[PDB]
Amino acid sequence: GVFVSNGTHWFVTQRNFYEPQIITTDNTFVSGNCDVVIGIVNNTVYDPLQPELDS
Amino acid sequence: QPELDS
Amino acid sequence: PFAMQMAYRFNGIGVTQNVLYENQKLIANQFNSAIGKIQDSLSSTASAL
Ligand SMILES: *[C@@H]1O[C@H](CO)[C@@H](O[C@@H]2O[C@H](CO)[C@@H](O)[C@H](O)[C@H]2NC(C)=O)[C@H](O)[C@H]1NC(C)=O
Ligand SMILES: *[C@@H]1O[C@H](CO)[C@@H](O[C@@H]2O[C@H](CO)[C@@H](O)[C@H](O)[C@H]2NC(C)=O)[C@H](O)[C@H]1NC(C)=O
Ligand SMILES: *[C@@H]1O[C@H](CO)[C@@H](O)[C@H](O)[C@H]1NC(C)=O
Q: Which of C3, C4, C22 sits opposite A36 (nearest CB)?
A: C22
At how many Å resolution was this determined? Answer: 2.4
Distant-in-sequence, close-in-space partners of A54: CB < 8 Å, separation ≥ 6: none
Atom of ligand 3 nearest to the CA of A39: 13
Approach to solving: cryo-EM
As a residue count, chain A comes to 55
Q: What is the 3-state secondary structure (H, E, C) of chain C?
A: CHHHHHHHHHHHCCCCHHHHHHCHHHHHHHHHHHHHHHHHHHHCCCCCC
Distant-in-sequence, close-in-space partners of A39: CB < 8 Å, separation ≥ 6: C3
The torsion angles phi and psi of C7, rounded to 5 degrees, stand at -65, -40
